[PDB]
Amino acid sequence: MVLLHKSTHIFPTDFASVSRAFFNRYPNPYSPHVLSIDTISRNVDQEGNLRTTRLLKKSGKLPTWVKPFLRGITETWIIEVSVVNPANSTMKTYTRNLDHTGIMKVEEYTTYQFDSATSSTIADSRVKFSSGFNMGIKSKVEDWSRTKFDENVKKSRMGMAFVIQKLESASFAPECTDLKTKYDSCFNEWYSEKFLKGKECSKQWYAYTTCVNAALVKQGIKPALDEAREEAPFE
Amino acid sequence: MVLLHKSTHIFPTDFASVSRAFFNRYPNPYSPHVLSIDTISRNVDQEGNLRTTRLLKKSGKLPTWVKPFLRGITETWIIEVSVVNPANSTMKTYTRNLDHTGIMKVEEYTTYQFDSATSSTIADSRVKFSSGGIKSKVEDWSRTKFDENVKKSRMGMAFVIQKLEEAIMSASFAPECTDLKTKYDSCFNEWYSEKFLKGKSCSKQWYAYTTCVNAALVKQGIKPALDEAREEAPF
Amino acid sequence: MVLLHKSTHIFPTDFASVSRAFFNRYPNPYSPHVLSIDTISRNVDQEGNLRTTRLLKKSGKLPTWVKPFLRGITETWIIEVSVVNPANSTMKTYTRNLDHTGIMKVEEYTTYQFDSATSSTIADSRVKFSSIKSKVEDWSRTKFDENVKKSRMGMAFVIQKLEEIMSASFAPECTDLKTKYDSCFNEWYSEKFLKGKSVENECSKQWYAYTTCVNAALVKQGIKPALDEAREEAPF
């Protein structure tokens, strides 16, 4: 069963601020379940657009309709894929869960564009919930999905606003966090001062990605992540 | 079965600040479950007192003792009724849930009074839990919920008061109404603080907003329960 | 079954700031479940170190594997024991749950020390969970990861706030007294004790009023025997 939801939020600020905030959105007080975020790949493609894949870990609980052994708190992984076009001031993002996909797959697409008439950045989100099994509890799944969607809409807008206002996070592998911080800082400067302006972090990136990959080898999620990295969600 | 709880909090500030904060208390980082707040009716009565009814939506979970089909995350609607007397610096407020009432009804009365002698505003709260073999469990649940609510109320109000004193908005349940709501609320807030509370005294903004909300409410399952509740006289 | 976890966090600030923040860490937006914190005992010992025992109450839920009547939201009590050596810029802390210990006991030790090479305060934490093995493991790992995050975010929040809304007593009738005591203590702690200038504050009147109130409330609480028992223990 497939359930679709959609939302629009308008940020009263420039595209550059919104996109930077996206890359720095966690941690914030409105997203308590997020535990870590790592950058898996990043490059500027030949067309001049930034392509990034990130991996998030969160705590959470499966719905009450699942088998009892699967109930309770656990950690889940999310892939996040994005493209930024600095010349057109556009961004597209996609997320999906990497685990529990037979029970529930939740995919979210968001596009960001600038409304010059109102000097604001428009974020249009579409979410697809794909539920595996029970039709007998259709209404319940529906209710659940709506509730999840509504919570996510709020968390997204509050968290982004928080970060935007602040501008004016851990690796899943603690031994990589310091390296991540060093890379992220380098990237943030380059992103704001060079890339978005149409105008450098190789050592920091190398150290960090080597650390993350060594950690990922030992993680059960790696095959699922590799598989998802094969997908082309924007195609 | 009826369980009663009471609490008092003293805000070390003036009535105007506390009352304004009440109308703008959400969102705040201490109340993650609140999803929207709408103004259903508002007027100054012939005695000069402000009468307001609002409608809140929250996410939440029913207690573990309910039927398995009812367990899990859901959304609930809350009615909020208030009277403000600016001459006497008093406010009274009442909330109750509109749905799930067969399982649990939770009613809260709060009075706010300015004590000029101690330069403080006293908030006295009373909560009545009316529950439809597991008495001790219901008691524990009610105590815990109450203690959580006391904390969230004082922390959230303090957060908002501090923001207003040193001088990110709430959603409508109907996203197509949120922008209209923001415009109405802005107008009201200015009138409330600068004119009403000072004894010196938004129709277009109100009209557009309320027309939007009512059109959305027609389509909501909660409308009959809301109408019923609006007939009640909690004070 | 015993499950062990460990973590390290480095705060880019001085020992005094980190230690003060520890005693004022709640409330903060990253720890929604904490409902109250009370000081049960405090003294400067003959060696010049601050010995404190505190009692925290939090809301929470037992794991899904417990009997159905025990499921659902509840309140739980935590003991927190600490020692501060201002001369050496060291602090050690210990927490454990006082109730439900037959189901799950969670003990955490944290040490704070100053790394002069990096001008930072190092916090080393070790957690022991004493308890469907895989499910318990998943639960413990998840709880640990959540707690590591809440601790670092909450501490950073409070440190930043003081560099640039108070906690409740479990007994509401004692909160005002607690605030008066805590304020006095805080001022002394930062201005005198951490600077090696005093082993005795002027907070005795505030302490007396507050502790008398708390103890009167504690007599009526089911947790008192468990608290007394835990206070007999010597975690360090």
Curated annotation (Swiss-Prot), chain B:
Outcome of mutating residue 84 to E: Strongly impairs interaction with MDM35. Failure to complement the mitochondrial defects of UPS1-deficient cells
Effect annotated for changing residue 33 to E: Failure to complement the mitochondrial defects of UPS1-deficient cells
Major site of localization recorded for this protein: mitochondrion
Gene Ontology cellular component terms for the protein in this record: mitochondrial inner membrane; mitochondrial intermembrane space; mitochondrion
GO terms, molecular function: lipid binding; phosphatidic acid transfer activity
Mutation effect (residue 97 to A): Failure to complement the mitochondrial defects of UPS1-deficient cells
Topology versus the membrane: Peripheral membrane protein
Effect upon mutating residue 54 to E: Decreases phosphatidic acid transfer activity and impairs cardiolipin biosynthesis
Database matches in InterPro entries: PRELI/MSF1_dom, Slowmo/Ups
Required for mitochondrial targeting as annotated region, ranges: 1-80
The protein's name in its UniProt record: Protein UPS1, mitochondrial
Assembly, per entry: Interacts with MDM35. Found associated with a 170 kDa complex.
Domain of life: Eukaryota
Phenotype reported upon loss of the gene: Cells show slow growth, fragmented mitochondria and have a 50-fold reduced level of s-MGM1. These defects can be complemented by human PRELI or bypassed by growth on a nonfermentable carbon source.
Residues of the PRELI/MSF1 domain: 2-167
Protein family according to the UniProt entry: Belongs to the slowmo family.
Protein's cellular compartments: Mitochondrion inner membrane; Mitochondrion intermembrane space
Annotated consequence of substituting residue 152 to E: Failure to complement the mitochondrial defects of UPS1-deficient cells
Impact reported for residue 25 to K: No effect on phosphatidic acid transfer activity
Mutagenesis or variant effect for residue 141 to E: Failure to complement the mitochondrial defects of UPS1-deficient cells
UniProtKB/Swiss-Prot annotation, chain C:
Keywords (A to Z) from UniProt: Lipid transport, Lipid-binding, Membrane, Mitochondrion, Mitochondrion inner membrane, Transport
Substitution effect: residue 54 to E: Decreases phosphatidic acid transfer activity and impairs cardiolipin biosynthesis
Source taxonomy: Eukaryota, Fungi, Dikarya, Ascomycota, Saccharomycotina
Name of this protein: Protein UPS1, mitochondrial
Effect of residue 143 to E: Failure to complement the mitochondrial defects of UPS1-deficient cells
CC per GO annotation: mitochondrial inner membrane; mitochondrial intermembrane space; mitochondrion
Database matches in InterPro entries: PRELI/MSF1_dom, Slowmo/Ups
Protein species of origin: Saccharomyces cerevisiae (strain ATCC 204508 / S288c) (Baker's yeast)
Principal localisation: mitochondrion
